[PDB]
Structures are given as C-alpha cells and as structure tokens.
Amino acid sequence: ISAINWNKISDDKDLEVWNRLTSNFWLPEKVPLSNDIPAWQTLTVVEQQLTMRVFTGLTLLDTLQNVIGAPSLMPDALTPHEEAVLSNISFMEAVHARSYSSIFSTLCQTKDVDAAYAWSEENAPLQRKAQIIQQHYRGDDPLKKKIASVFLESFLFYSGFWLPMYFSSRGKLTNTADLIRLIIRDEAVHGYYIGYKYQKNMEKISLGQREELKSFAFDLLLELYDNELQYTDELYAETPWADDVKAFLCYNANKALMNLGYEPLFPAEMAEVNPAILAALS
Amino acid sequence: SAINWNKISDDKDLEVWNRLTSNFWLPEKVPLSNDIPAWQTLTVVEQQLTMRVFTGLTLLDTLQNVIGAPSLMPDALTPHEEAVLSNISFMEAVHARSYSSIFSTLCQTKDVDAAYAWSEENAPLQRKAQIIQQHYRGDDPLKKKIASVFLESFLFYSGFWLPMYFSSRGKLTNTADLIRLIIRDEAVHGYYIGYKYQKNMEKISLGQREELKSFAFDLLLELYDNELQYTDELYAETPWADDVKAFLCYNANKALMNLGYEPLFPAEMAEVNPAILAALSP
Amino acid sequence: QLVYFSSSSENTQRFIERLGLPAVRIPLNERERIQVDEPYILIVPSYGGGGTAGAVPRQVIRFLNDEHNRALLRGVIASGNRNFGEAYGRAGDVIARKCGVPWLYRFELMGTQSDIENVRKGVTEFWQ
Amino acid sequence: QLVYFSSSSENTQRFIERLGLPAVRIPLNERERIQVDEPYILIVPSYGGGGTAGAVPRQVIRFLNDEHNRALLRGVIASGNRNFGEAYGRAGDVIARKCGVPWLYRFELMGTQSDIENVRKGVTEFWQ
Numbered sequence: 001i002s003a004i005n006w007n008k009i010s011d012d013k014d015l016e017v018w019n020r021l022t023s024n025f026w027l028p029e030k031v032p033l034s035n036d037i038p039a040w041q042t043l044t045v046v047e048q049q050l051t052m053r054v055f056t057g058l059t060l061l062d063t064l065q066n067v068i069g070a071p072s073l074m075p076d077a078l079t080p081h082e083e084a085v086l087s088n089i090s091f092m093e094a095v096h097a098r099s100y101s102s103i104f105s106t107l108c109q110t111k112d113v114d115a116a117y118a119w120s121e122e123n124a125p126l127q128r129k130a131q132i133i134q135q136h137y138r139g140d141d142p143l144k145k146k147i148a149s150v151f152l153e154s155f156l157f158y159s160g161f162w163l164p165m166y167f168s169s170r171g172k173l174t175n176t177a178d179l180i181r182l183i184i185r186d187e188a189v190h191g192y193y194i195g196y197k198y199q200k201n202m203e204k205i206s207l208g209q210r211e212e213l214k215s216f217a218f219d220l221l222l223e224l225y226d227n228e229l230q231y232t233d234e235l236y237a238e239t240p241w242a243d244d245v246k247a248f249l250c251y252n253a254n255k256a257l258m259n260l261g262y263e264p265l266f267p268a269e270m271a272e273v274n275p276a277i278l279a280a281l282s
Numbered sequence: 283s284a285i286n287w288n289k290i291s292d293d294k295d296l297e298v299w300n301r302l303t304s305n306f307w308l309p310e311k312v313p314l315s316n317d318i319p320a321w322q323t324l325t326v327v328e329q330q331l332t333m334r335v336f337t338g339l340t341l342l343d344t345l346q347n348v349i350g351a352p353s354l355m356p357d358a359l360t361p362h363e364e365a366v367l368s369n370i371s372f373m374e375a376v377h378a379r380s381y382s383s384i385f386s387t388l389c390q391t392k393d394v395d396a397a398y399a400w401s402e403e404n405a406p407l408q409r410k411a412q413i414i415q416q417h418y419r420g421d422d423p424l425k426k427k428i429a430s431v432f433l434e435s436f437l438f439y440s441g442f443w444l445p446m447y448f449s450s451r452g453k454l455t456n457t458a459d460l461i462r463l464i465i466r467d468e469a470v471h472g473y474y475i476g477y478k479y480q481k482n483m484e485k486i487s488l489g490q491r492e493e494l495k496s497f498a499f500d501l502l503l504e505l506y507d508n509e510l511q512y513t514d515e516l517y518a519e520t521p522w523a524d525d526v527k528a529f530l531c532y533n534a535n536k537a538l539m540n541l542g543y544e545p546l547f548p549a550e551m552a553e554v555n556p557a558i559l560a561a562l563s564p
Numbered sequence: 565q566l567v568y569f570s571s572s573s574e575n576t577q578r579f580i581e582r583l584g585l586p587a588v589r590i591p592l593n594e595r596e597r598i599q600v601d602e603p604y605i606l607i608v609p610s611y612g613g614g615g616t617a618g619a620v621p622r623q624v625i626r627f628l629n630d631e632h633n634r635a636l637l638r639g640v641i642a643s644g645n646r647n648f649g650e651a652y653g654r655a656g657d658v659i660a661r662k663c664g665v666p667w668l669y670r671f672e673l674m675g676t677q678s679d680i681e682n683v684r685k686g687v688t689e690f691w692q
Numbered sequence: 693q694l695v696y697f698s699s700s701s702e703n704t705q706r707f708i709e710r711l712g713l714p715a716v717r718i719p720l721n722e723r724e725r726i727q728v729d730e731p732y733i734l735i736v737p738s739y740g741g742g743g744t745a746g747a748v749p750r751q752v753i754r755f756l757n758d759e760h761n762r763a764l765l766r767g768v769i770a771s772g773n774r775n776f777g778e779a780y781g782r783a784g785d786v787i788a789r790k791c792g793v794p795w796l797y798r799f800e801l802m803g804t805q806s807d808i809e810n811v812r813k814g815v816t817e818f819w820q
C-alpha cells in the first residue's frame with residue numbers, strides 16, 4: 001500500500017474517467033419523481049405490474065454490482081488510481097439500487113411492491129442469471145470477472161431499461177425516464193472503463209490465453225442471451241412487446257462486445273430497434 | 283438479495299446514508315489558488331512540515347479506501363450497511379485525492395517527491411500503517427471497527443492540527459476549508475462505525491465485552507505511544523510538539539466516546555489552545 | 565428537573581447516567597408522547613449537518629409544540645461535535661432563539677469529565 | 693483521404709481498420725504534430741459527458757487550429773455512445789458549427805456492420 005499521487009499518472013484514462021464519474025454525481029432526490037404520479041395513475045394493471053417486476057429485478061443486479069461486482073475487481077487493479085475509480089463505481093451502484101426504491105416509494109402501493117419482490121425471488125431465469133454472474137466474481141480469473149461485469153450492465157440490464165424508454169416516447173413517466181438516463185449515462189462509462197482495463201490486462205498474458213478468453217466470452221454471451229430471452233418472455237408475457245425488447249437486447253449486446261474490444265455479433269435484422277426507443281435514449 | 287430502502291431495519295442507516303451523500307464535495311469546489319500568497323510567506327521549516335503531513339495522510343486515507351471500509355462490508359448487519367460502507371470507501375478516495383490538489387496548487391514537485399520519500403522512510407508512520415492493516419486482514423470483525431475508529435477520529439489529528447493552526451493565524455484559510463470538509467466526513471464515519479461496533483457488542487457474551495475493552499485501551503496506548511514518536515519527528519524543528527500531543531489526547535477521548543467508552547485522558551492532558559478549537563468550530 | 569432526548573446511539577443517555585441527576589427521557593418511539601409537570605432544562609443533541617433547519621430531532625419538536633411543555637421550558641443545553649464547524653450545537657440556539665429561553669451549555673458526545681462538572685454546578689446556580 | 697483521432701482505448705482505430713479506406717492518424721502524443729496536404733473528412737470521438745464545450749479531444753484542436761490543416765477540412769464524422777443523450781456525437785456538431793463544414797455521420801464505438809457500409813457509400817458520394 002503506497003501513498004497515492006494524482007500528479008503522477010501512469011494511465012491518463014484513470015484521471016479522465018475519475019473526473020467524469022465524480023462530476024456526474026447525482027442522487028434520486030435530485031429528480032422530481034412525484035410529478036409522474038398522474039401519469040402512473042393512467043397505466044393499465046398489466047403495465048403497472050410489469051414496471052414493478054422490472055425494477056425489483058434491476059435492484060437485485062445493481063445490489064450484486066454494489067456488494068460483489070465492483071469490490072471483486074479491486075484486487076486486480078493495474079494502477080492505484082484504478083482502485084479509486086472502482087470505489088466510485090461501487091458506491092454509484094448503491095445509488096442506482098437506492099433510486100429504484102425511490103420509485104416504489106413515490107408511485108406504488110406497498111402490497112404490490114412486495115408481490116413484485118416475491119415474484120423476482122421465484123423467477124428462475126433471473127436467479128439463474130445472478131448465480132452465473134457471481135460464480136465468475138467468486139472465481140479466480142480476474143479477466144472473466146471483467147467480462148461478466150460488462151455483459152451484466154452494458155447488455156443484460158437493457159431488457160428492463162427498455163420499459164421506461166418506451167414510456168418516455170409516449171410522454172408517460174418522463175421523470176422516471178430522466179432518472180434511468182442518469183443510470184444509463186453511468187453504465188456507458190462503467191462498461192467503457194472496465195472493458196478498457198480488460199484489454200489492458202490481456203496485454204500482459206500470452207496470445208493462446210487471449211484466444212481462450214475470446215471463446216469463453218462468446219460462449220458466455222450466448223448462454224446469458226438464451227437465458228435473457230426466457231426472462232423477457234416471462235416479464236412481457238402479458239404484452240405484445242417482447243420482440244421489440246429482444247431487438248433492443250441484441251443492439252446493446254453488440255455495444256457490450258465493443259467495450260471489450262470485440263466485433264459486434266448480432267446482424268442488422270436482430271439489432272433493428274424501434275426508432276422511438278433510440279430517440280428516447282438520445 | 284434485492285435491497286429495499288422502504289424496509290429499513292435500523293433507522294440509523296438511512297439517516298447516515300442521507301447525511302454522507304448530501305455532504306458530497308470535491309476538492310475542485312474549494313478555491314485553493316487564493317492561498318498561494320499566504321503560502322509564499324511561510325518559512326522553509328513550515329512548508330516542509332506541511333508537505334510531510336499531507337503525504338502521510340495520503341497513505342492512511344488510501345488504506346481506508348482500499349482495505350479499510352471494504353473489510354467492514356462482509357461483516358455488515360443489514361444490506362443498507364453495505365451501501366453506506368460503499369460511500370465511506372469512495373469518500374476516502376476523495377479525501378486522498380484532495381491532498382494532491384493541494385500539492386498541485388501550492389507546492390513544487392521536487393519538494394513534494396522529497397516529502398513522499400520522507401514518508402516511506404519514516405518508521406512510526408509505517409508502523410502505524412502496518413498495525414492497522416494487520417487487524418483488517420484479521421478474522422475478528424469487532425477489532426476491525428476499533429482500528430478504523432481510532433485511525434480517523436484520533437491518529438489523523440496529529441496532521442489535522444497544522445491546517446487548523448494556520449487558520450487561527452489567518453493563513454491558508456482555503457486549505458483549512460478543504461480539511462474541514464474531510465473532518466466533517468470523519469466525524470460521521472467514526473460515529474457510524476462506532477455505533478455499529480456497539481450493535482455488534484450485543485451478540486457477544488458479557489465476559490467477551492471485557493476482553494475487547496482491554497484490547498481497545500491496549501491498542502489505543504500502543505498507537506498513542508507511536509503517534510508521540512511520529513509527532514516528534516514531524517514537528518522536530520518547531521515549538522508546537524507539546525500542543526499537537528494535547529490535541530491528540532482531546533481527540534482520543536472522542537474516539538473512545540464513538541465506541542461508547544469513558545474518556546481516558548484527563549483535562550490537563552487534553553487541554554488544547556482555544557485558537558485551535560475555534561478554528562475547528564467558529 | 566431535566567428533560568432530554570437520545571437516539572439509538574445513546575450518547576446523551578450515557579451523559580445523564582454519568583451526571584447523576586434525576587431526568588425524564590423523550591421516547592424514541594414517535595407515537596408515544598410524554599408530559600412534564602414542572603419547570604425544566606432541556607438537553608438536546610444536534611442532527612443538522614448543515615443549515616437546513618432540521619437540527620432539532622422530530623421527537624423534540626413534537627414535545628415542544630405542545631403548549632403545556634413549552635411554557636415550562638426554562639433553558640437549553642446542546643450536545644454534538646465540534647467537527648461540524650459553525651453547526652456545532654445548532655439545536656441549542658435554534659430552540660433558544662424561537663422560545664426565547666437562554667442557551668446554557670455546549671458539549672460533545674457523552675461529555676468529558678469537565679463537562680459533567682460544569683453542568684452540575686451550572687444547573688444549581690441557574691435555579692438560584 | 694481520411695483523417696482521424698483515437699484514444700488508447702482505440703475504438704475509432706478499429707473502425708478504420710475495418711473500414712479499409714486509406715487514412716492518417718492524429719498522433720496520441722500531444723507534442724508530435726502532423727501536417728496534411730490534401731482535402732479530407734475528419735473522424736473524431738466525443739469526450740464531452742455534458743455541455744462544457746470540451747467535447748473535441750485536445751489533440752484534434754491542435755490539429756485543427758493550424759490554418760494549413762483547417763482549410764483542407766471538408767466534413768466531419770462523429771463517434772460516441774447514444775447513452776450520452778443529447779450529447780451523442782457532440783464533437784461532430786461542434787467542429788461542424790465552428791468550421792462551417794457539414795456534419796456527415798454519427799456512429800457508436802467501433803461501429804456496426806451497417807455503419808461501415810453506410811460510411812463507405814457515404815464517403816464516395818461525398819466527393820461526388
């Protein structure tokens with residue numbers, strides 16, 4: 001353990017990302033969520049249950065990123081400045097998780113929230129997903145953890161993030177959408193940075209080991225992809241929106257792969273998103 | 283499991299989470315440039331001491347960021363406890379980063395690097411760093427919380443004495459403002475970790491508490507003796523040695539009170555010059 | 565007589581156990597309300613952090629907005645931490661400024677041996 | 693001819709390696725400056741985050757504010773991430789609005805297969 005010197009930087013990216021993530025600081029209290037109450041009241045029962053089940057699911061995975069995800073990456077930092085950025089990432093994962101509770105508190109009835117929580121506990125595809133991710137976090141290979149993390153938030157999360165972006169384009173729950181855009185803005189930098197360090201870590205291992213990890217990543221991606229199709233089908237079962245959610249999943253999967261330095265795998269047909277969703281994103 | 287901020291077990295987690303998060307700050311928000319004319323009036327002895335003090339505090343804050351707070355996470359009682367500990371951890375990086383902001387604005391690189399080398403060579407500083415780290419790697423959750431509270435509610439104040447002293451003389455007033463933000467964080471840090479130590483005391487047997495009380499006071503006095511030596515080597519060419527030691531005794535009593543213990547040092551040992559106490563609280 | 569509030573951390577609670585003087589505690593549970601029948605000095609910990617008016621705990625405000633207890637208030641002592649800068653003992657002068665009563669003493673956490681000493685001598689000389 | 697900048701993450705670098713078209717890179721080392729003697733389209737990544745002007749990388753500015761290189765600039769293509777909301781491809785329209793040259797394309801990270809096909813068809817049709 002050495003005394004950190006922020007005026008002796010080894011990798012310029014450490015300072016750039018530190019500065020970006022810190023000055024991007026936000027709290028769920030900054031967003032006037034209570035203004036979405038009238039728009040919430042106009043939703044059907046199906047749409048209400050779906051929203052609550054989406055966020056109860058996202059709370060689990062962000063808690064996982066808070067407690068196990070980001071802490072597990074810390075021992076494998078290349079610079080001391082990298083350790084400090086991962087400390088921020090960890091805390092912001094708690095802010096992410098905390099802000100989903102702000103939504104339930106403002107909009108929803110306690111009885112329905114607990115029902116949605118109990119639904120997420122019983123949901124097999126969700127639990128299978130969370131067990132795969134943390135299996136790699138508890139593992140001994142530092143590079144597989146960095147893959148698992150990028151896949152989780154740069155790709156898997158977007159099965160749930162689709163919903164508020166859809167509501168946004170319809171002019172409903174606009175403040176909740178503003179909240180989610182702050183999370184998404186965090187996660188783009190999280191994926192970029194962890195993906196970047198993945199590539200830096202690969203620059204000190206043999207070429208044969210690199211190819212072994214490339215085969216692993218694409219196998220893991222397809223494994224999680226097949227499981228997420230099942231998760232989408234169970235969530236959006238009461239709606240006719242599943243195919244559109246699946247399109248949005250393939251679109252981000254490509255970005256997740258590009259964070260790690262690999263080419264996009266999913267072709268135009270599969271990754272063709274409804275333009276209103278992309279418009280709500282930008 | 284999925285964290286729920288609407289199902290709070292210990293009401294103190296939410297209060298501390300809200301305080302620490304809404305206290306968020308960055309060294310860039312403090313106008314350190316206005317202290318450059320004040321810095322140029324300080325003598326060679328005073329400047330050398332200032333740099334040696336902050337390089338020492340950089341090591342200890344980094345230790346809190348990397349090992350300190352993260353070693354308290356698996357020993358948490360509630361899920362909300364882990365989310366607060368994420369924040370403490372992150373803010374230790376901000377603390378450590380802010381000392382570099384001071385060096386950048388005021389000091390010269392040859393003098394700064396010499397100070398870093400001095401901190402590497404210093405025996406009491408390394409001894410303090412080793413002893414605290416030793417308990418974090420340990421298997422006892424109760425001793426971890428003792429070491430953490432002692433470090434930042436007591437030991438740091440041998441260094442924090444200097445900015446407060448300059449503040450009472452009307453020098454480096456903006457630097458002291460930055461320090462008061464770090465001090466404000468640590469008062470909450472020590473309070474919270476001390477409070478959680480007392481909640482952990484409820485589960486161990488009546489006789490087991492008596493052994494921890496003995497250990498705490500043993501550790502305090504072992505570190506106190508080491509901090510006297512560290513103080514003497516720092517303030518060697520200044521008549522302020524005895525005033526810093528009184529400020530240590532005053533803060534040691536507060537560290538004990540955070541853990542729920544009687545103050546050990548009597549009034550005549552802990553009597554600080556009112557100017558130092560006025561700089562801390564106007 | 566002394567009336568006080570203390571959170572689950574029980575810092576002000578341990579101060580009054582070490583003080584020795586008989587006192588009544590403002591309940592931690594917000595539903596239960598306690599009533600006092602004689603003139604008293606109030607001992608309250610600060611929880612402001614900054615200057616957002618919320619320095620005085622909720623259980624104390626509910627105790628003091630009651631006209632019966634408020635009329636019997638004679639003085640206030642604030643506890644806290646010097647590390648909060650200008651906000652050290654903020655609950656003291658806020659109650660003192662609103663009710664008109666004087667702000668008597670100011671101490672940290674559980675109180676030092678000098679603190680208990682000054683509160684013992686202070687309270688008796690106040691009544692006289 | 694194409695002129696481009698890429699960081700140590702090399703997202704834009706891998707787009708041009710997969711583009712196939714002849715291109716020259718703006719040096720990562722800030723001290724090293726390059727000169728271009730032909731008309732070009734500039735491909736640049738965005739590093740804004742928000743709206744504090746600093747969307748264009750530092751090495752690109754030093755390339756552009758040189759009168760020799762600026763004159764031969766004909767168009768600009770931006771890369772980035774849609775997740776940055778309104779700030780997606782901010783470096784593109786900042787160079788466009790200032791220099792007066794049109795903003796041609798907008799792609800994410802390494803660029804999709806669609807993007808590469810769109811840029812190949814776009815570049816040839818631009819010189820026409």
Ligand SMILES: Cc1cc2nc3c(=O)[nH]c(=O)nc-3n(C[C@H](O)[C@H](O)[C@H](O)COP(=O)(O)O)c2cc1C
Pocket residue numbers: 297298301470473569570571572573574575576577609610611612613614619643644645646648651652653654672673674
């Ligand atoms: C969230 C929080 C805010 C606080 N704000 C202040 C403050 O503004 N001024 C002060 O002097 N002390 C402040 N303190 C310190 C407390 O006043 C101190 O710990 C006191 O001993 C608490 O007493 P109790 O345990 O009986 O509740 C604060 C503590 C916490 C946890």
Ligand SMILES: Cc1cc2nc3c(=O)[nH]c(=O)nc-3n(C[C@H](O)[C@H](O)[C@H](O)COP(=O)(O)O)c2cc1C
Pocket residue numbers: 016017020189192697698699700701702703704705737738739740741742747771772773774776779780781782800801802
């Ligand atoms: C600190 C930071 C800020 C960024 N800001 C933006 C932005 O404002 N708009 C945008 O579209 N992309 C933004 N991005 C995403 C990058 O433009 C994207 O990762 C790009 O592909 C990087 O290319 P390069 O590796 O060649 O440098 C940002 C990335 C980082 C790390």
Ligand SMILES: [Mn+2]
Pocket residue numbers: 062065092093096153187
């Ligand atoms: Mn997250």
Ligand SMILES: [Mn+2]
Pocket residue numbers: 065089093153186187190
């Ligand atoms: Mn993340």
Ligand SMILES: [Mn+2]
Pocket residue numbers: 343346373374377434468
């Ligand atoms: Mn600290």
Ligand SMILES: [Mn+2]
Pocket residue numbers: 346370374434467468471472
């Ligand atoms: Mn601390």
